[PDB]
Amino acid sequence: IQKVILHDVLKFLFVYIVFLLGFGVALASLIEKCPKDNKDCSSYGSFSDAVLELFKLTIGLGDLNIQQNSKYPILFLFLLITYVILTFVLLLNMLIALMGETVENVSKESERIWR
Amino acid sequence: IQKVILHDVLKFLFVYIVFLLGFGVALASLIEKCPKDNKDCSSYGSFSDAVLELFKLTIGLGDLNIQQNSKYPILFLFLLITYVILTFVLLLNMLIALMGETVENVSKESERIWR
Ligand SMILES: CCCCCCCC/C=C\CCCCCCCC(=O)O[C@@H](COC(=O)CCCCCCCCCCCCCCC)COP(=O)([O-])OCC[N+](C)(C)C
Ligand SMILES: CCCCCCCC/C=C\CCCCCCCC(=O)O[C@@H](COC(=O)CCCCCCCCCCCCCCC)COP(=O)([O-])OCC[N+](C)(C)C
Ligand SMILES: CCCCCCCC/C=C\CCCCCCCC(=O)O[C@@H](COC(=O)CCCCCCCCCCCCCCC)COP(=O)([O-])OCC[N+](C)(C)C
Ligand SMILES: CCCCCCCC/C=C\CCCCCCCC(=O)O[C@@H](COC(=O)CCCCCCCCCCCCCCC)COP(=O)([O-])OCC[N+](C)(C)C
Ligand SMILES: CCCCCCCC/C=C\CCCCCCCC(=O)O[C@@H](COC(=O)CCCCCCCCCCCCCCC)COP(=O)([O-])OCC[N+](C)(C)C
Ligand SMILES: CCCCCCCC/C=C\CCCCCCCC(=O)O[C@@H](COC(=O)CCCCCCCCCCCCCCC)COP(=O)([O-])OCC[N+](C)(C)C
Ligand SMILES: CCCCCCCC/C=C\CCCCCCCC(=O)O[C@@H](COC(=O)CCCCCCCCCCCCCCC)COP(=O)([O-])OCC[N+](C)(C)C
Ligand SMILES: CCCCCCCC/C=C\CCCCCCCC(=O)O[C@@H](COC(=O)CCCCCCCCCCCCCCC)COP(=O)([O-])OCC[N+](C)(C)C
Ligand code: NA
Ligand code: NA
Ligand code: NA
């Protein structure tokens, strides 16, 4: 756990943000602006609405209220489907990177420095 | 299945609770208290609200009703995003631990004691 966090998480994060902001500037032009009614509008901007929904859709707390009230609702959904596929590729190459060149030598280096 | 449950689950759980209670005492100070209205308030405390939502967000039954009605709503969300990343690191090192030093010797010890 100390080997992944101190060494191998910043590999995952720095490629995640460029995939976050890559779809972040794309989805922000699709989102219709919050001041349509201003009765329950407490948003933080057009760019801020697009990025915060990509956090919630990754951790599993996403909704569909913005996808319905959008400019192009079908085109807004296909970038969300593509975002899941790119996220799964990021999660699947983290396992291959933690199996670097031998699955035993990872268990060796955690056993030597434990003692 | 009998090898993971009897031997290898308590490795996962005892590191999960210290990551549960680590964010449990942190998120409990962010949650605004339930007696605001007392018409549908049947909570079990400030600490009990923070821990039970981390069970639901892990198993996939989480909501966003408390994150909206919080003190710092953006700061409440970033600890939930960090909690998913730490949970995924816990789930990803369980697979490397079950592949300890050879993927064949795990299949050997389950074949010898079956006979
Ligand atoms: C403005 C400048 C550029 C900025 C952008 C780039 C900045 C640079 C960022 C990442 C690249 C690493 C560069 C470090 C030095 C270079 C030498 C090197 O090869 O790297 C290595 C040195 O490993 C490290 O030292 C990791 C650097 C983080 C140190 C601790 C910081 C706290 C992490 C807090 C984390 C967040 C908290 C978590 C929860 C939120 C890395 O190699 P490895 O990854 O160990 O691979 C080993 C795998 N293998 C053996 C199987 C093959
Ligand atoms: C790896 C990191 C991430 C990867 C990148 C992220 C993924 C990139 C994916 C997509 C990039 C962004 C797509 C939408 C961009 C425009 C949106 C928009 O503002 O609509 C507005 C503009 O209306 C238009 O003129 C265009 C409408 C959408 C066109 C769809 C084609 C692109 C689909 C993809 C195919 C491209 C091929 C791509 C190559 C494979 C509509 O607003 P309006 O008010 O109703 O109309 C008035 C017009 N006015 C405002 C100017 C006056
Ligand atoms: C290391 C990263 C974290 C730290 C750096 C943060 C990076 C910036 C990320 C996010 C912005 C957070 C601070 C900016 C202003 C406050 C909020 C806001 O955006 O709304 C503003 C407009 O809303 C917009 O639409 C502006 C967003 C587009 C420009 C910002 C992205 C810059 C590059 C992307 C990142 C490139 C680098 C990323 C590489 C990792 C209005 O503000 P407000 O809503 O009315 O709230 C008041 C603010 N207050 C209460 C605080 C006074
Ligand atoms: C990797 C997979 C992810 C997808 C691609 C990833 C890249 C994504 C990038 C770009 C992708 C292409 C963008 C298309 C834009 C939508 C336009 C449209 O369809 O017409 C209409 C919808 O009509 C429908 O409802 C059709 C149903 C939609 C899904 C089709 C079923 C798939 C079955 C077959 C299986 C194949 C499955 C897909 C192939 C693999 C209108 O849609 P609109 O424009 O939003 O409405 C605005 C109204 N306006 C224009 C009048 C203002
Ligand atoms: C009070 C203060 C302390 C309390 C905190 C600490 C308490 C101690 C807790 C865990 C540490 C284990 C210590 C046990 C003896 C020490 C010897 C040893 O090295 O451990 C080993 C002895 O393996 C075991 O005996 C596991 C202990 C559980 C026994 C059955 C209890 C029911 C499990 C119910 C489960 C919950 C029900 C599931 C659904 C909810 C463990 O090693 P391993 O894991 O087998 O590694 C093998 C992997 N490899 C070969 C690939 C390398
Ligand atoms: C591995 C296991 C997990 C790890 C740990 C888990 C994660 C730990 C993360 C974070 C730990 C907890 C952060 C919040 C704590 C205070 C919250 C609070 O009660 O607010 C109250 C206090 O108001 C304040 O004075 C502070 C408000 C928040 C400040 C945010 C900075 C810390 C962010 C993180 C950066 C730290 C660097 C961390 C190092 C990387 C507001 O209440 P009020 O009534 O509106 O105001 C009246 C004030 N009064 C009540 C006193 C009179
Ligand atoms: C082995 C672990 C399981 C067993 C031990 C459980 C340990 C405690 C865990 C969970 C609590 C369960 C029992 C405590 C009291 C009852 C409920 C409650 O909390 O609400 C109370 C206040 O609410 C609070 O805010 C108190 C929470 C902070 C102190 C508890 C953490 C102890 C240290 C961290 C954990 C220790 C380390 C654990 C490491 C594994 C009020 O109670 P009530 O809501 O009005 O309901 C009436 C109660 N009755 C119906 C039952 C009569
Ligand atoms: C591993 C990743 C997890 C995150 C870090 C892990 C550690 C987490 C610990 C601490 C984290 C840092 C503390 C943040 C506190 C929020 C304050 C704030 O932003 O201002 C304002 C919000 O304004 C906005 O809405 C800004 C938009 C939010 C997200 C920015 C987009 C990210 C794009 C860039 C890509 C970078 C993505 C992130 C970098 C990787 C106010 O927000 P508030 O305070 O809640 O409201 C209370 C009002 N009050 C103050 C008046 C009472
Ligand atoms: Na779900
Ligand atoms: Na899943
Ligand atoms: Na293998």
Swiss-Prot record, chains A, B:
Q: Where are the transmembrane segments?
A: 1-30, 72-108
Q: Where in the cell is it found?
A: Cell membrane; Cytoplasm; Lysosome
Q: Which residues lie on this side of the membrane: Extracellular?
A: 31-42, 69-71
Give tissue specificity per the record: Abundantly expressed in CNS. Widely expressed at low levels. Detected in dorsal root ganglion (at protein level). Expressed in the keratinocyte layers of the outer root sheath and, to lesser extent, to the matrix of the hair follicles (at protein level).
> Which family does the entry's similarity section mention?
Belongs to the transient receptor (TC 1.A.4) family. TrpV subfamily. TRPV3 sub-subfamily.
Assembly: Homotetramer. May convert from a homotetramer to a homopentamer to allow pore dilation. Interacts with TRPV1; may form a heteromeric channel with TRPV1. Interacts with SNX11; this interaction promotes TRPV3 trafficking from the cell membrane to lysosome for degradation.
What job does this protein perform?
A: Non-selective calcium permeant cation channel. It is activated by innocuous (warm) temperatures and shows an increased response at noxious temperatures greater than 39 degrees Celsius. Activation exhibits an outward rectification. The channel pore can dilate to provide permeability to larger cations. May associate with TRPV1 and may modulate its activity. Is a negative regulator of hair growth and cycling: TRPV3-coupled signaling suppresses keratinocyte proliferation in hair follicles and induces apoptosis and premature hair follicle regression (catagen).
The protein depicted here goes by the name Transient receptor potential cation channel subfamily V member 3
Question: What is the species of this protein?
Answer: Homo sapiens (Human)
UniProt gene name: TRPV3
Q: Which residues of the full protein are shown?
A: 579 to 693 of 790
